[PDB]
Design a protein around this nucleic acid. Structure first.
Length: 49
DNA sequence: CGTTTAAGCGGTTGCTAGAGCTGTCTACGACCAATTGAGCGGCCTCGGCACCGGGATTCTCCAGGGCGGCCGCGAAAAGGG
């Protein structure tokens, strides 16, 4: 998935929208429950690989 | 201490250097006036060093393309009642 916007070729069109939604979800989740202290964020019961 | 030798003193004999005195004069330096150009201060400018803007040149990083390994998953061959 590559495209040209304003003369810049091979721009990641798929990764631009994916990083925009992931950063907005990460910023909203941190500010909702850890607004006083961002260092106290915990993954909870979610177990990654 | 023994021995030789050269310093010290007195003497010759003539000429010349030098101090002292007297005399003349002449070039040379003090002195004065007019003049001006070489010394001291400032003013202006270039040679060279340095500061700043612009352009050419080479090094570093992020992402895409392709390949290997896992995850149970699922179709299939063989055995049992």
């Amino acid at each position: 998935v590559l495209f040209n916007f304003k003369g810049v070729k091979s721009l990641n069109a798929e990764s631009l929208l994916s990083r925009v939604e992931d950063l907005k979800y990460l910023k909203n989740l941190i500010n909702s429950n850890y607004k006083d202290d961002p260092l106290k964020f915990s993954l909870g019961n979610n177990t990654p690989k």
